[PDB]
């Protein structure tokens, strides 16, 4: 075993030696030589989180210790602990005691901003001006007051037309798996051994087929809603309103608007749906 031994008050019976808890583990023990009772508890541990502004900006980092006091558990011991190579003593960079734990490497200021990197319990950190890592308390918003009165009202005179976008996912990639090749690659004996398990692969294929059909049904419900295919007249004058950036252009081989092209080009930074690939991939 390994733990911290202290005195205990559990009055053992004459024949009882060990002790257990609800956690089905040993918790108390009697010394083999002297008739003393001792309790077993593991020594301190915890978790470590690293806060960084990103390698593209700077290499400075801030280290957060979770659920420990700055001084009660000073992981700053001579040297050899877990993650031994770090020292991060940094008494110069003031250690800030947060609700989550001890934050070492950041400076605490009497300010308020938006939350850039969430730490916990209303404390956020950001890389701000020379340049260093700071910690503060997030600000809910700008203060305001409304001039309420028994007889007072405000009426607008001007209007603003606003256009905002909204993106919603619809479907995901349809995939299928093969049991025999994935589990036992090129082994008849392994397949024969698998045969003794019965059917643990009908369920997987059934679930994946259901998912694929579900995806197709989702797309059909979302888009297929009109029974006719209308066309706009060749003249594109609508009361002075200009719709040239969303109506399709017949000139392009693919009947897609400019904004649709921008969306496709933006999303194509990652396209794993290479259906066009075939068995010709033997290069």
């Amino acid at each position: 075993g390994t733990g911290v031994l202290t005195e205990s008050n559990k009055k053992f019976l004459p024949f009882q030696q060990f002790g257990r808890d609800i956690a089905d583990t040993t918790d108390a023990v009697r010394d083999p030589q002297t008739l003393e009772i001792l309790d077993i508890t593991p020594c301190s541990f915890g978790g470590v989180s690293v806060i960084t502004p990103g390698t593209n900006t700077s290499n400075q980092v801030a280290v957060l210790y979770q659920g420990v006091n700055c001084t009660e558990v000073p992981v700053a011991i001579h040297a050899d602990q877990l993650t031994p190579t770090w020292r991060v003593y940094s008494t110069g960079s003031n250690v800030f005691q947060t609700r989550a734990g001890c934050l070492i490497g950041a400076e605490y200021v009497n300010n308020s901003y938006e939350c850039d990197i969430p730490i916990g319990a209303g404390i956020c950190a950001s890389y701000q001006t020379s340049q260093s890592i700071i910690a503060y308390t997030m600000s809910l918003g700008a203060e305001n007051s409304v001039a309420y009165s028994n007889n007072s009202i405000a009426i607008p005179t001007n209007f603003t037309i606003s256009v905002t976008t909204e993106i919603l996912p619809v479907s995901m990639t349809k995939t299928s798996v093969d049991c025999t090749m994935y589990i036992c690659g090129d082994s008849t004996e392994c397949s024969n051994l698998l045969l003794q398990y019965g059917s643990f692969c009908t369920q997987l294929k059934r679930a994946l087929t259901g998912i694929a059909v579900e995806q197709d049904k989702n797309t059909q419900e979302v888009f297929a809603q009109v029974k006719q295919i209308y066309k706009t007249p060749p003249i594109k004058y609508f009361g002075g309103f200009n719709f040239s950036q969303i109506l399709p252009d017949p000139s392009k081989p693919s009947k897609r608007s400019f904004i649709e092209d921008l969306l496709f080009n933006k999303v194509t930074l990652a396209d794993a749906g290479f259906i066009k690939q075939y068995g010709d991939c033997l290069g």
């Binding site: 919603l168 996912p169 049991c179 589990i183 004996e189 051994l193 969306l263 990652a270 749906g273």
Partner: protein
């Protein structure tokens, strides 16, 4: 701002990559290649030696299928919301706030 559509692709790619990387797991066996086990050892213990790998890979497949089933429900919810928004905003005028 197209993070919602990027997250789906990223999650699917990462899950598939983890599934294909899982094949290197020893699962307590001496080696991760079936052919080596067959060539170097007789059947009497090769049966259990390959059985351990069978159990590990079956568990991995089950975990992957469960994750896909869980994600399908969220995708369905998003699709239903999108269909409702299409029907209530594009085809008419909505008095609901926000």
């Amino acid at each position: 701002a197209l993070g919602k559509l990027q997250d789906v692709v990223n999650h699917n790619a990462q899950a598939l990559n983890t599934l294909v990387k899982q094949l290197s797991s020893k699962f307590g066996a001496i080696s991760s290649v079936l052919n080596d086990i067959f060539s170097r050892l007789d059947p009497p213990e090769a049966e259990v030696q390959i059985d351990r790998l069978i159990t590990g890979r079956l568990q991995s497949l089950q975990t992957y299928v469960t994750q896909q089933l869980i994600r399908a429900a969220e995708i369905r919810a998003s699709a239903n919301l999108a269909a409702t928004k299409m029907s209530e905003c594009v085809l008419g005028q909505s008095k609901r706030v926000d």
